[PDB]
């Protein structure tokens, strides 16, 4: 019918296991049967399909979570700036305002997470780490007040990034920590937003990230590892920031990412032969605007002037039909419990799937009710494009710190 996933021909997209069953085919078939039940529900209940983003339920879930969380969140006690970021960004995508008092309370809490040696920890008094540093800077840029900008100690932040920098061009996540592509992205994101990029900070970084692109076309956590959506987004987004996307084979990358959209489910998988997951709506589909900008900068004449190189409609259908929790919040797939991480990325991926843009060109695809339209998101930073412009302009009136 008007919904791609509900067309009779869509039944042909089901798994073809070639009569050879393995753990992979068995697990995929189970997910497909579950998704088919969701897709068929309208037909079985004799109702007209209505794709509605449950804005009010999502807002209630988010406004509450911003102040207080159950003990189910104990496993995120060293990730508190991530929770600020996930919630504040989900509220920004839903066009929900931050009361000036809440903005102030977030600023003050992120100040407590900030290390006297630079960067942010996952909670008050915790050691600094690149992942809560990225989340804290992103959350402060979402608030975007002078008070939020002033929380960041730019000189100590630069000193902190230098303390993690490795001779091979990579970065540690934290002191005595692990090295992987996420760290290059977390460092490049905070350094570009706060205007602390010195001539040698990212020396060898582009080359180290390019060594993470493997035989599949995608990018692994470290050289030699299996290509993965989260790492591929981190790798490409860091190269966009560094203006070094050409270090990658962009065509093998384009082919690998597009192949990650599931023909049946419509959503994206994180790796080849794994299951669909709503958060890959951002990590994987977020690569298509980055590749479009990269190919366009090389003057590609065959690029679309209205759509991203993925099925925008099928992704929105997967998110709207399978990833909404009735009580508010979004999830990985049907049968999974809601969480602020999936709420953030399902809505981020929905915004990307709704909003196309390339220079002068602007084209929206809004599946279901028109009220489903979200605020746009910057494909590099995953914060509002207006917040990116405002933060960059503000930090550009400050000099890059000296030694």
């Amino acid at each position: 019918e008007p919904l791609y996933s509900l067309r009779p021909e869509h039944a042909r997209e089901r798994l073809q296991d070639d009569s050879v069953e393995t753990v992979t085919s068995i697990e995929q078939a189970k997910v497909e049967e579950k998704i088919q039940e969701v897709f068929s529900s309208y037909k079985f209940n004799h109702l007209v399909p209505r794709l509605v983003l449950q804005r009010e339920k999502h807002f209630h879930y988010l406004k509450r979570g911003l102040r207080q969380l159950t003990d189910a969140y104990e496993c995120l006690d060293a990730s508190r700036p991530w929770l600020c970021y996930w919630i504040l960004h989900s509220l920004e995508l839903l066009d929900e305002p931050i009361p000036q008092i809440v903005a102030t309370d977030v600023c003050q809490f992120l100040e407590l997470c900030q290390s006297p040696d630079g960067g942010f920890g996952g909670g008050p008094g915790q050691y600094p780490h690149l992942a809560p540093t990225y989340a804290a800077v992103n959350a402060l840029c979402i608030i975007g007040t002078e008070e939020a900008y002033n929380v960041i100690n730019r000189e100590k932040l630069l000193q902190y990034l230098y303390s993690l920098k490795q001779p091979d061009g990579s970065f540690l996540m934290h002191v005595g920590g692990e090295v992987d592509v996420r760290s290059a992205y977390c460092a490049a994101s905070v350094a570009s937003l706060t205007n602390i990029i010195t001539p040698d900070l990212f020396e060898g970084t582009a080359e180290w990230i390019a060594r993470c692109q493997n035989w599949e076309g995608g990018i692994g956590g470290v050289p030699g590892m299996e290509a993965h959506g989260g790492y591929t987004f981190c790798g490409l987004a860091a190269l966009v920031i560094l203006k070094k996307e050409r270090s990658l084979n962009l065509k093998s990358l384009l082919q690998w990412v597009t192949s990650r959209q599931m023909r049946f489910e419509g959503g994206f998988q994180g790796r080849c032969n794994k299951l669909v997951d709503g958060c890959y709506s951002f990590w994987q589909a977020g690569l298509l605007p980055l590749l479009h900008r990269a190919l366009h900068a090389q003057g590609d004449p065959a690029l679309s002037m209205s759509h991203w190189m993925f099925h925008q409609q099928a992704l929105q259908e997967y998110i709207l039909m399978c990833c909404q929790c009735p009580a508010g919040g979004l999830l990985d797939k049907p049968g999974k419990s809601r969480d602020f991480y999936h709420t953030c990325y399902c809505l981020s991926g929905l915004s990307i799937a709704q909003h196309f843009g390339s220079g002068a060109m602007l084209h929206d695809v809004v599946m279901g009710v028109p009220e489903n339209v979200l605020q746009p998101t910057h494909p590099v930073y995953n914060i509002g494009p207006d917040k990116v412009i405002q933060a960059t302009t503000h930090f550009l009136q400050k000099p890059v710190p000296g030694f």
Partner: protein
């Protein structure tokens, strides 16, 4: 003298005699809190005591046992892991007992980043990789796609030069699940770091093995990605027999993967000044249209992009 966190006789640190001297330090969440977690009593109790030993930098046997509880409560707390490693060195703890502990904790939470990083630090300290491959194989026996397990496996093999039995282990896992992409990745990792793919006998063996895998399971994307990945290097057009050999699977072993591979062969032929240039282009454009409209419509935008791209370049 361990008192397990799940033990029916576990007692809160605030009710323990050997901890009476120390005042627990509460978390400073500020006056108006945000993303405040309503911690369970057990969690709050261990973390208020951990905050006290950390703030005073107490490098004691009791602080060491306390980190085990704090890790058990939240194994992602990297500050706790850092302090535990400070204590392992300061207290001169037996690192083989610490390996027994990390083995048990990884078995419980095999997806946690911190646990694998700690195991790597221990292996580095001990300069002992002897237990590694067998421990990883036990994790992979439970989840054959565990990304941290495969990453630790590659680190182990590369660092300690344990290449010799890896292709055999890869062959075993591929028999179990030919669709396991992490295993196809390991295959490439092993070959590229040993013989390489420049050795013609190795390349031939790999392409034949992959083609036999494709015949058994034609819709298995991993084997198709692997065949492409090992040949795309020198260029698909460099292998003239490949096209005819795939075109001979068109009635029997067809899939949008076979069709997509044909388009990749045609793209490369068109870039390397092939004979019957206009014929190749139209063959490629026909397959692009079939893929976009019929066989692979989820990728319609990609296939239309390729169609336009091929036209723009090779018209």
């Amino acid at each position: 003298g361990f008192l397990s966190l799940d033990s029916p006789t576990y007692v809160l640190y605030r009710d323990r005699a050997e901890w009476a001297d120390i005042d627990p330090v509460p978390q400073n969440d500020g006056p108006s809190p945000v993303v405040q977690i309503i911690y369970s009593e057990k969690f709050r109790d261990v973390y208020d005591y951990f905050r006290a030993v950390l703030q005073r930098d107490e490098r004691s046997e009791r602080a060491f046992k306390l980190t085990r509880d704090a890790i058990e409560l939240n194994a992602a707390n990297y500050t706790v892991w850092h302090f535990r490693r400070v204590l392992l060195r300061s207290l001169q703890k037996d690192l083989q007992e610490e390996m027994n502990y990390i083995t048990a904790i990884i078995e419980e939470q095999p997806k946690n980043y911190q646990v694998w990083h700690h195991r790597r630090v221990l292996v580095e300290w001990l300069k002992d990789p002897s237990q590694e491959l067998e421990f990883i194989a036990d994790i992979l026996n439970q989840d054959a796609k565990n990304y941290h397990a495969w990453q630790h496996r590659q680190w182990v093999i590369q660092e300690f030069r344990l290449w010799d039995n890896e292709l055999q282990y890869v062959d075993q896992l591929l028999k179990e699940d030919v669709r396991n992409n992490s295993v196809w990745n390991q295959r490439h990792f092993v070959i590229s770091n040993t013989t390489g793919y420049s050795d013609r006998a190795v390349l031939e063996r790999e392409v034949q093995y992959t083609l036999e895998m494709i015949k058994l399971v034609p819709h298995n994307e991993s084997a198709w990605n692997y065949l492409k990945g090992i040949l795309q290097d020198r260029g698909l057009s460099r292998y003239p027999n490949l096209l005819n050999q795939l075109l001979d699977l068109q009635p029997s072993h067809s899939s949008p993967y076979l069709i997509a591979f044909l388009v990749d062969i045609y793209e490369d032929m068109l870039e390397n000044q092939c004979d019957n240039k206009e014929d190749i282009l139209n063959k490629a454009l026909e397959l692009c249209e079939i893929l976009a409209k019929e066989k692979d419509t989820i990728r319609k935008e990609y296939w239309r992009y390729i169609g336009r791209s091929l036209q723009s370049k090779h018209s």
